Amino acid sequence: SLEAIVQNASSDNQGIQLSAVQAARKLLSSDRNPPIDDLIKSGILPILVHCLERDDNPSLQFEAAWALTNIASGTSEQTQAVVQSNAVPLFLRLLHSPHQNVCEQAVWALGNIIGDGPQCRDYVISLGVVKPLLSFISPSIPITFLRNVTWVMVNLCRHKDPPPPMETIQEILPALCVLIHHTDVNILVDTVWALSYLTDAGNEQIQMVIDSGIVPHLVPLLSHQEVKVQTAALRAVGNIVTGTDEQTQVVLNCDALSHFPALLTHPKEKINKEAVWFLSNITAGNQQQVQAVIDANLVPMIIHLLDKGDFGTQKEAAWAISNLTISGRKDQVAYLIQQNVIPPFCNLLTVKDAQVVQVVLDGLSNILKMAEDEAETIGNLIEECGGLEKIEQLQNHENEDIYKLAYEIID
Amino acid sequence: GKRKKIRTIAA
């Protein structure tokens, strides 16, 4: 019965009270459909929140914070009810408890509260949770607790609009740089996903990340044995290289391109796609970065992915080679045309997506404009792969820019 | 990963 537990949870008999709070925790935890609504409806929230402050009996503190965590793990109305019961300041107090399982359940409850949205996040931030949370980053703390701490940090960084206060982000960044020195896969994955979220906001936070000196620790994770770490690190470093050429070169100076042969040939199509997206952002930069790409001998592999890769990887590879054509040297475009580029490039002129067609058209046009001297040789190659057929068929494309560009480059 | 987590077992 759901009334007996709330009736016994207020009993002055400490044994029966702790048993009842434990039974409430069990009802909220073990099952797939916890009866959170009826439990709140019976008035258990104030009882649990006032059990939170009984320093005399830490087991009761633990069980109460546990039940509150599992209540806050549900809908936004239930997390907001936990918050309305003024449990956040009590969790912030429990952070300093000498009993580490109580202090860990407090962190878990705070993480569930922060995960609801920017409002609860900014409430918990304004009450000063960042520094007491980061004080747990030490070898003494067991790795389960540190995993929960890294998860709370991820929840702190996950929402971009409205973003957490830049002061809090500045306080968080060194903690992430400390956590990235870890070996545990879950901690590393969470740290790198938090870095990925932070880099999403724009070039300001990209520069903030770079100033932390964490890129030297993040880049080598592209070759980690665990593929989850690999995809997380690839996302983060791609976000970074979407920034200015100096930021991209900061990433490149850690020798990131060394880690990409194993990515362009990875068995998972997703890692291929993300690697070619990274390299496409690299080719859009200065000609020094294009030459750095060519030096690592990555051009043949991105050509091969353009040829025989999955659809999204093919789109990213078309983007890579087209940015290369736009911001590349005549000799480098010749290097491209030399490595069987145009035959597999022209087979994507038939796809339904209009952006890929626009991109391949502009790429071919700009290589022909870049090499008008010896264009007579290049144009005959298109006939071999049946590319001229698809170009004169594109002349009938619906949107105007594609057809007018086909007409414009028929020369 | 997940934004909210439910704790089932303690040790």
Q: What is the CATH number of the domain that holds A96?
A: 1.25.10.10
Closest by CA to A82, choosing from A92, A72, A91, A74, is A72
Resolution (A): 2.8
Closest by CA to A355, choosing from A393, A312, A301, A392, is A312
**Residue partners of A178: CB distance under 8 A and separation at least 6:** A137
Question: How many C-beta atoms lie closer than 10 Å to residue A257's C-beta?
Answer: 21
- Cis before A35? omega within 30: no
Instruction: Name the burial class of residue A209, with classes exposed (0-12), middle (13-18) and buried (19+) by CB atoms within 10 angstroms of its CB.
Output: buried
Q: Tell me how many domains chain A contains.
A: 1
Closest by CA to B10, choosing from A357, A63, A39, is A63
Could you give the maximum distance between any two Cα atoms of chain A, in Å?
Answer: 95
Read off the amino acid at residue A369.
Answer: K
Q: How far apart are CA A268 and CA A229, in angstroms?
A: 14
Tokens of A372: 């008008």
Q: How far apart are CA A59 and CA A57, in angstroms?
A: 6
Tokens of A409: 């480059």
Q: How far apart are CA A319 and CA A283, in angstroms?
A: 9
**Residue partners of A389: CB distance under 8 A and separation at least 6:** none
In this complex, the residue of A66, A72, A154 whose CB is nearest that of residue B10 is A66
* Shortest alpha-carbon distance between residue A63 and chain B (Å): 10
Q: How far apart are CA A72 and CA A64, in angstroms?
A: 12
A59 CB within 8 Å of a chain B CB? no
**What is the interface size between A and B, counted as CB pairs within 8 Å?**
41
Containing domain of residue A372, as a range? Answer: 2-409
- 3-state secondary structure at position A46: helix
Contact (CB<8Å) B4/A158: no
Helix (H) or strand (E) holding A350: none
Backbone angles phi, psi at A302, to 5 degrees: -70, -30
Contact assessment for residue A133 and residue A142, using Cβ atoms and an 8 Å cutoff: no
Helix ranges (DSSP H) in A158-220? 166-179, 185-200, 203-211, 215-218
Contact assessment for residue A102 and residue A62, using Cβ atoms and an 8 Å cutoff: yes
Which residues of chain A neighbour B4 with C-beta distances below 8 Å?
Answer: 72-74, 79, 112, 115-116
Contact assessment for residue A20 and residue A8, using Cβ atoms and an 8 Å cutoff: yes
Contact (CB<8Å) A29/B7: yes
Cα-only R_g, chain B? 9
Distance of CA A338 to the CA centre of its chain: 37
Question: Is the Cα torsion angle A194, A200, A205, A208 positive or negative in sign?
Answer: positive
Find tokens 């959170």 and name the residue.
Answer: A36
Helix (H) or strand (E) holding A201: none
Tokens of A44: 């258990």
A274 CB within 8 Å of a chain B CB? no
